[PDB]
Amino acid sequence: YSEYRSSYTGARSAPWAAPEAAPAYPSARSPFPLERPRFRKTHIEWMLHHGHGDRYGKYGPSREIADFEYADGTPSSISGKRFALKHHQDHLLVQLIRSAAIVERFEEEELLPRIPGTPEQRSWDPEIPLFLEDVDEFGRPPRPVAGATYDPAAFVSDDIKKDVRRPFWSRRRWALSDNFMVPMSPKPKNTIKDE
Amino acid sequence: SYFKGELFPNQLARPLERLPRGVSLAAARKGQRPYVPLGEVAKLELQGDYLTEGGLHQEALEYYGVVAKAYELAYPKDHPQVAGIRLKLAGAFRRTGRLTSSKANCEAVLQMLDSAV
Amino acid sequence: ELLHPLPVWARRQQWLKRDTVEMNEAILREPYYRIKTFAQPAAFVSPRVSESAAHEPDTQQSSRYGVDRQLRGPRRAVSPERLQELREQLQFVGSIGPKVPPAAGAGTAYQDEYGTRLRPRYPQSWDTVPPHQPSRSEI
Amino acid sequence: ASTAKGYMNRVMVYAHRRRKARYLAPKNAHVRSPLAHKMPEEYGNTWDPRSGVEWHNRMRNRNHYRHWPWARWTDDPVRFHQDSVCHRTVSALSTVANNGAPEWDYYAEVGQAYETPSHFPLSYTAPFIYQYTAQCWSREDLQSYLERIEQSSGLRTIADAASRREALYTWWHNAGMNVIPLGVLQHLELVSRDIVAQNARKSYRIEQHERGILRTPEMERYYALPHLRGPSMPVQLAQPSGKYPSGKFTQMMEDVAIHPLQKPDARYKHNMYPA
Amino acid sequence: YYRATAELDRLRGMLRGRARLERKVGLKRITFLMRTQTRYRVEQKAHWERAIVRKNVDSAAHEHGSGWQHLRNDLARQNLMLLPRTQQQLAQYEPLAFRAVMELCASRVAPPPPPMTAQVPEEAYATRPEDPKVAHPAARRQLEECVERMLCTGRSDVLQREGPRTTQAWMDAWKEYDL
Amino acid sequence: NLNKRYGAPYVAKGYASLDPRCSLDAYSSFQQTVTSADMKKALLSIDSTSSGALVIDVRSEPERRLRPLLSPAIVALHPHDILSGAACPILPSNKERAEMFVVASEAQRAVNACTALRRWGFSRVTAVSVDAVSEAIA
Amino acid sequence: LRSANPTIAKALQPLIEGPKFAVVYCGNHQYKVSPGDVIAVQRLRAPIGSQIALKKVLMVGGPRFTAIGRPLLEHVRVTADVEEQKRMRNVVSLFSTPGRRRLRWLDAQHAATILRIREVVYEPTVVGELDKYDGVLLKDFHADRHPNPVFTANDGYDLYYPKDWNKVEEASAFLEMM
Amino acid sequence: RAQHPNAGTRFGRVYNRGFVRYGFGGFGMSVYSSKKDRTFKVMPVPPPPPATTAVEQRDDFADNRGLSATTRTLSPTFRMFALEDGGVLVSHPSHAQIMRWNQRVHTEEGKAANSTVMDEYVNSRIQAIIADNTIENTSLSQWRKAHMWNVIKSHGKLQRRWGTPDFVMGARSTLYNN
Amino acid sequence: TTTIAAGPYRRVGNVFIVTCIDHPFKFSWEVNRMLRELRLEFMGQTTVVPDIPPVRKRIWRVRHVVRVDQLDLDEAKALIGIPEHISFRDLAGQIPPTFGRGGSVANPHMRSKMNFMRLRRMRLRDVMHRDQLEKRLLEERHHALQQQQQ
Amino acid sequence: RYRLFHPVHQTVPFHFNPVQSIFPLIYENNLLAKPRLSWKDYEGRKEFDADHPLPVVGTRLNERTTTHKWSHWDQYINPQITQSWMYLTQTPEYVGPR
RNA sequence: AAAUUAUUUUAAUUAAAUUAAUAAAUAAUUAUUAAACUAAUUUUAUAUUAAUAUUAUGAAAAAUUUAAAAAUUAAUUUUUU
Structure with a gap:
């Protein structure tokens, strides 16, 4: 008979919500945490989301379940490629267990630094705050009573301004607007390092 | 990434060692299908081995019981495989001292092996 | 040669790139560890600060609710003293060294019953695949 | 994808050379470049191009x-890997005395x-002095030496043991000399001249x-x-x-808005007859 | 250099005029027309051939008001896992069953949940006072969850009872071998 | 042609969401005071049968040996385990209702550690008294 | 078939009987399989003339029903019989680049076993009626009533809506379950 | 000439299609630009039905709604049930119950004024499907018109070529190409 | 509950799951070197590296190539069903050290003489077995002979 | 789109390989380690039941062999087989002419 | 200069310097045969060598640098079974 396991232990989480209650649909917005582009899960993020790999027949219930079985029930045999999958599965666990048997060691000898980020990285990114302790970051503390605030927003104006046409429909405003740099005609990409 | 197993002559389908035709067990020893989900018990009978190999013998006894029940339903009398599980089952009692049934369940695999062909 | 312009879809799917890297280096500046308490839940919600656009809340039809089912749930090893109450029960079956057999009730060891080289006759099948060639694990 | 018969026979559609081991370093050999023979972090060293x-x-x-580093580590030309602490001592009871002598500064x-x-009191330089003198005195033994110094002598602080190295020894000579091995003292003097040093380098750095x-x-x-003390925009x-x-x-080139009642300057057009 | 002539020498029988008569022009033709097939076939036939199958299911999803743009993504939503080569067999030879897949995706039915990773049976957190005769609470936990699933698969003779079969005695089928 | 696909909180974003203002307010709390009653209220938070230590001391490990304050089981955190964010897994849930405190050797580190907290979304902490919590032995 | 509602199994039973096609998944390929239908699957290490049940089954449809098994269907039996265990037509890859002097006549015989199915049965278990357009299991099921009654999508508010011949835009879904 | 392996493409140089485009750098080889891609691009989506639900039927990237909004016609007949495995059992009206329905809609389509000489033709082909399943599709016609000839060459061994031993059947079975 | 939680504080590391999203053959010889030290060459390959410091640089240099994911260790002890009490420095203390592709010795020869002797200590394991049968029979044949004269 | 944002935590799904695979008794606390060490160690196909013997469908490693000539060991054991001078093949180190 | 005869294989790569009444010679590369496990880390990852064989002087797209260049030149990562 056919079989559907989906996991080593079976016991699928109930697929149906309730005898009549709301059905609890899954999150269908792609986890790209900016919120502005608002993407959708694209088949492959909806195949990963269901516990395959990025392809149909990788890691999934389409690869664990037997190809067939003798109709009386006597199961298949260990395909020479199957065993090499079980070794590949175990090679991920051991890749995880070892790679935590090292960490569970480092925290034991305090070897994990308290400052997050390697020395070269921390020089590269200015969001990891400097890890000075007994000084202030920007030199002297605000000795002056602050009540001392600069708001970028007052003076720093980033406005996408429409480059206004020189109004030809009115005569005088066409003549003032005549910014005497229309002699941009000297823009030939001329030889900038020779003559 | 997954590397498919290599082919190599150490992977042949060797034949299971059959005692020759014109010979039965006791001739030397006294000289001295229905659908049964065997895919589900093969995984179970294995989980018994890991328990009798680890040292939870009593807990592996209760698994081999189940396998000794599904095996005698699928295979007919006298079958070899039904003689294989009531053999390890007999080796499961002896860890837990129940030698009254261990030897008895193990003396019956002989009377289940000799009567074969 | 670079003649006609990069198609727009490519530039857009390359703005997703720098916003992938801008999401890696957010991971590569996390603290190397997390000071945690035994008594408290494992991760009651306790994620990183990844609540910028939080998703999959539904507790089912959510990818993570095989894991945070157990994290948010009450932690059983609730104290370092409770740990030894739990860590003193596990054995190591195969590790190198000596042991004390009668520590159990009445168990009689296995490796000193079928010898060291012989393995139980595992039923080889598709679903059940036992370790093959056991005489290669002796280094 | 396009996998074709073997590990390292992946994509096989791009025209790169597979089987080429990109991880391995280039054999720069004769070519002259700062990038020669250097692990990539050492590229900035353009004063010793290799x-x-x-x-x-x-x-x-x-x-x-x-065997290129003809003298690598693990050779000492001077003391040939034998600890310089005399065990041939007059009295066997006092052989344990010389243990814990400083072979160099150890601290600076x-x-x-x-x-x-x-x-701080002296008893708080013990965790440093120890890490160089284990195999000589148990840690809890130092806290018996680094307290009798505080009790008996007139010295209490790390700054004192750096300003009174003469007054301290003379105490040890005429009062100690039976318990406190002078190994501790010249160790105690080597840290107290460092903790005092670094605090001068920290206090200056702050x-x-x-x-x-x-x-x-x-x-x-x-x-x-710097931090603001006055108005941001000057x-x-x-x-x-x-x-x-x-x-x-x-x-009035542009960007100017005026009420229609209050239109200005039409002295010849429509201000001549104002309303 | 070996031109596999005796592998082509008898196959010029299906080339055209000049190639069949002469040999050094017959081979040269086929050992090229063969050399381009097995190059067309590895790198080019699929991404053409698998576009007829996509153009088929699309215009067969198109009949039902949906596109391939929407069907290809509304299948993987429902974890449905039908390769396009199959949807093309259903688009043609089983139209109703295909539209069933169509009307399923358009429906607002909750797609199946992702599979739960393995869980920790809570008996691991109790310390069995080791008595020889009583099983560990985590084994008789695993067993019951493996026997209830063996009675789950296929109509069999195994303690054949209506619906759910007999278990609390199936777990203790070792005593039936006991004396 | 960004800011059409992404928002304005793109390119015009000072991704330095760390400390444009909090550091100032850190030096504000530094100014006012902390004293007995300011610990006595915390004493009631120790009097609360629910024992989660209120104040924390960011001081070097040799310092605390000299004036041990660990008596009420208060938390001893290295000032980087705070700065780096390794301490958030032990920090109150009510970011707007909780006010722990921060003891430190010299009051520059305290405010320099409490600003790290207010960078982690915390609202009230008056951020120092090395000597009061000893005069308020509890 | 089985069900929890005694009135479902009365209306749904006459649907399952009849010849059923199943969409098996054998050797990383999918097939549409009828009972007396013959498929050529990639080689399964099985003897010739021995019965075989195919485990992975993504779909089973008959003349009137079709069980769209999400990722896989359980309780369905698609058993088969191995007839031939052979190398199908051999397609030669002639590999040689025009630069080097070297040829490689790689004959890729494709070992493929050729199954003839016998038994395609289906033992489902229906929980309850499910309303397509807002997925919630319904309490009661009535053979005659359509759970999702449907309505003409021509509001009249637009001029450039394509009005097909006025026979198809005015149509009903004939009630079949009774 | 410096003839050293590793100084250029190992043996000569070849221009396979994975090179003529995606050359070193991916921007393509100077000459041999590439063939134009003459595949069959899928067509763009139809418009969804008007809303008239107020359920936010307009929202595209939402969790509830599958992308496709296809509430077409005698979809209410496709009333689906929830299985046990998590699957679905879609009960639809059989291929005969539809063509027999289609006849009814069509026979009352052209009869209002005058059933054309083609309208009489269609109802015949429709009434020919219920009775005989007179199939009209290429996929079978393309198959049957050939499969017969291919199998009759077998029953009557019209080979003329009996040797064909998978070396001579090597070119063939690949000079054909499906 | 408005209180810094009070209790004996355990610290838990992190475990990075790294994948490869850009092809390696476009990048340098150093960037390929980092990917090699993360057990990553082909696109789509995936490994589970720890969050120890010198890994943090290797991953950093190749941030534009990989797609990382971090797991606190408790969020790993549940990704694989693991009892909370069992640490990982006892789980690994069970797997043999000769897992698939045991070592990474300095060149494919030293690899091929690390696998050779591994296939020798198998030969010797049966040969130290076959004489240990003889050395016990020989020490008995001596005692049977010795005690024969008494 | 091809820049997929997902938890790469998804691409190595542990739904089928949890530690109850490699450590089969861990909920039993005895913590036994029964892994599959390498694709190399694969012993081979083995009949789960004797009644369903694995078929003989040969491969390019069986159906394409040659008759066993007698090696210098098979002629050292049983000199009853060196029956003609075509059995006195050269030293094994001499592979053949250039 | 033109050639140099035997398919289905089973470990990778380039280099660019001393000199030349201007290329049979040298490095470096490649090759044939062979080698030994020196702190540095994860429980990561590593083609390093010896011995011989060797009729070679010029590196796409970039990044720049000389030059009326009007490309050559330096440059250095590519370089498809």
Whole structure:
């Protein structure tokens, strides 16, 4: 008979919500945490989301379940490629267990630094705050009573301004607007390092 | 990434060692299908081995019981495989001292092996 | 040669790139560890600060609710003293060294019953695949 | 994809050379470049470029630089790997005396972060002195030596044991000399002349950080703005705008809005008959 | 250099005029027309051939008001896992069953949940006072969850009872071998 | 042609969401005071049968040996385990209702550690008294 | 078939009987399988003339029903019989680049076993009626009533809506279950 | 000439299609630009039905709604049930119950004024499907018109070529190409 | 509950799951070197590296190539069903050290003489077995002979 | 789109390989380690039941072999088989002419 | 200069310097045969060598640098079974 396991232990989480209650649909917005582009899960993020790999027949219930079985029930045999999958599965666990048997060691000898980020990285990114302790970051503390605030927003104006046409429909405003740099005609990409 | 197993002559389908035709067990020893989900018990009978190999013998006894029940339903009398599980089952009692049934369940695999062909 | 312009879809799917890297280096500046308490839940919600656009809340039809089912749930090893109450029960079956057999009730060891080289006759099948060639694990 | 018969026979559609081991370093050999023979972090060292063939022959263990660092670590020309603490002593009871002598500074050349301010008691330089004198005295033994010093002598603080090295020894000679092995003392003197040193280098490092020198934890200079004490945008210091201040109202070029009742300056068109 | 002539020498029988008569022009033709097939076939036939199958299911999803743009993504939503080569067999030879897949995706039915990773049976957190005769609470936990699933698969003779079969005695089928 | 696909909180974003303002307010709390009653209220938070230590001391490990304050089981955190964010897994849930405190050797580190907290979304902490919590032995 | 509602199994039973096609998944390929239908699957290490049940089954449809098994269907039996265990037509890859002097006549015989199915049965278990357009299991099921009654999508508010011949835009879904 | 392996493409140089485009750098080889891609691009989506639900039927990237909004016609007949495995059992009206329905809609389509000489033709082909399943599709016609000839060459061994031993059947079975 | 939680504080590391999203053959010889030290060459390969410091640089240099994911260790002890009490420095203390592709010795020869002797200590394991049968029979044949004269 | 944002935590799904695979008794606390060490160690196909013998469908490693000539060991054991001078093949180190 | 005869294989790569009444010679590369596990880390990852064989002087797209160049030149990562 056919079989559907989906996991080593079976016991699928109930697929149906309730005898009549709301059905609890899954999150269908792609986890790209900016919120502005608002993407959708694209088949492959909806195949990963269901516990395959990025392809149909990788890691999934389409690869664990037997190809067939003798109709009386006597199961298949260990395909020479199957065993090499079980070794590949175990090679991920051991890749995880070892790679935590090292960490569970480092925290034991305090070897994990308290400052997050390697020395070269921390020089590269200015969001990891400097890890000075007994000084202030920007030199002297605000000795002056602050009540001392600069708001970028007052003076720093980033406005996408429409480059206004020189109004030809009115005569005088066409003549003032005549910014005497229309002699941009000297823009030939001329030889900038020779003559 | 997954590397498919290599082919190599150490992977042949060797034949299971059959005692020759014109010979039965006791001739030397006294000289001295229905659908049964065997895919589900093969995984179970294995989980018994890991328990009798680890040292939870009593807990592996209760698994081999189940396998000794599904095996005698699928295979007919006298079958070899039904003689294989009531053999390890007999080796499961002896860890837990129940030698009254261990030897008895193990003396019956002989009377289940000799009567074969 | 670079003649006609990069198609727009490519530039857009390359703005997703720098916003992938801008999401890696957010991971590569996390603290190397997390000071945690035994008594408290494992991760009651306790994620990183990844609540910028939080998703999959539904507790089912959510990818993570095989894991945070157990994290948010009450932690059983609730104290370092409770740990030894739990860590003193596990054995190591195969590790190198000596042991004390009668520590159990009445168990009689296995490796000193079928010898060291012989393995139980595992039923080889598709679903059940036992370790093959056991005489290669002796280094 | 396009996998074709074997590990390293992947995509096989791009025209790169598979089986080429991109991870391995280039054999720069004779070519002259700063990028020669250097692990990528050492690229900034353009004052010792490692080009040339002999650097190819000796980074790799080529012809006769076959064991290249002809004197690597694990040889000492001086003391030949035997600890210089005399065990041949007059009285066997006093053989344990010489244990714990300083073979070099042990404290300054390493540069540990002794966070002990120079006014702590002596009993708080024991965790440092120990890490160089285990195999000589149990840690809890030092706290019997580094307390009898505080009790018996007139010295209490790390700053004292750095300013009274003469007054301390003379105490030890005439009062100690039976329990406290002078190994501790010259160790105690080697840390107290460091904890005092570093606090001078820290207290200075904090006192420039106000004067505006601003160097990072790894001590590289980082330039950063001072804290505000007054108005952010300058008012009596503002540079003139820089574009000819013909206002929007002297030549009403654009951006000017006026009520229609209050239209100005039509002295010949429609202000001659004002309303 | 070996031109596999005796592998082509008898196959010029299906080339055209000049190639069949002469040999050094017959081979040269086929050992090229063969050399381009097995190059067309590896790198080019699929991404053409698998576009007829996509153009089929699309215009067969198109009949039902949906596109391939929407069907290809509304299948993987429902974890449905039908390769396009199959949807093309259903688009043609089983139209109703295909539209069933169509009307399923358009429906607002909750797609199946992702599979739960393995869980920790809570008996691991109790310390069995080791008595020889009583099983560990985590084994008789695993067993019951493996026997209830063996009675789950296929109509069999195994303690054949209506619906759910007999278990609390199936777990203790070792005593039936006991004396 | 960004800011059409992404928002304005793109390119015009000072991704330095760390400390444009909090550091100032850190030096504000530094100014006012902390004293007995300011610990006595915390004493009631120790009097609360629910024992989660209120104040924390960011002081070097040799310092605390000299004046041990660990008596009420208060938390001893290295000032980087705070700065780096390794301490958030032990920090109150009510970011707007909780006010722990921060003891430190010299009051520059305290405010320099409490600003790290207010960078982690915390609202009230008056951020120092090395000597009061000893005069308020509890 | 089985069900929890005694009135479902009365209306749904007459649907399952009849010849059923199943969409098996054998050797990483999918097939549409009828009972007396013959498929050529990639070689399964099985003897010739021995019965075989195919485990992975993504779909089973008959003349009137079709069980769209999400990822896989359980309780369905698609058993088969191995007839031939052979190398199908051999397609030669002639590999040689025009630069080097070297040929490689790689004959890729494709070992493929050729199954003839016998038994395609289906033992489902229906929980309850499910309303397509807002997925919630319904309490009661009535053979005659359509759970999702449907309505003409021509509001009249637009001029450039394509009005097909006025026979198809005015149509009903004939009630079949009774 | 410096003939050294590793100095260029190992043996000569070849221009396979994975090179003529995606050359070193991916921007393509100077000459041999590439063939134009003459595949069959899928067509763009139809418009969804008007809303008239107020359930936010307009929202595209939402969790509830599958992308496709296809509430077409005698979809209410496709009333689906929830299985046990998590599957679905879609009960639809059989291929005969539809063509027999289609006849009814069509026979009352052209009869209002005058059933054309083609309208009489269609109802015949429709009434020919219920009775005989007179199939009209290429996929079977393309198959049957050939499969017969291919199998009759077998029953009557019209080979003319009996040797064909998978070396001579090597070119063939690949000079054909499906 | 408005209180810094009070209790004996355990610290838990992190475990990065790294994948490869850009092809390696476009990048340098150093960037390929980092990917090699993360057990990553082909696109789509995936490994589970720890969050120890010198890994943090390797991953950093190749941030534009990989797609990382971090797991606190408790969020790993549940990704694989693991009892909370069992640490990982006892789980690994059970797997043999000769897992698939045991070592990474300095060149494919030293690899091929690390696998050779591994296939020798198998030969010797049966040969130290076959004489240990003889050395016990020989020490008995001596005692049977010795005690024969008494 | 091809820049997929997902938890790469998804691409190595542990739904089928949890530690109850490699450590089969861990909920039993005895913590036994029964892994599959390498694709190399694969012993081979083995009949789960004797009644369903694995078929003989040969491969390019069986159906394409040659008759066993007698090696210098098979002629050292049983000199009853060196029956003609075509059995006195050269030293094994001499592979053949250039 | 033109050629140099035997398919289905089973470990990778380039280099660019001393000199030349201007290329049979040298490095470096490649090759044939062979080698030994020196702190540095994860429980990561590593083609390093010896011995011989060797009729070679010029590196796409970039990044720049000489030059009326009007490309050559330096450059250095590519370089498809």
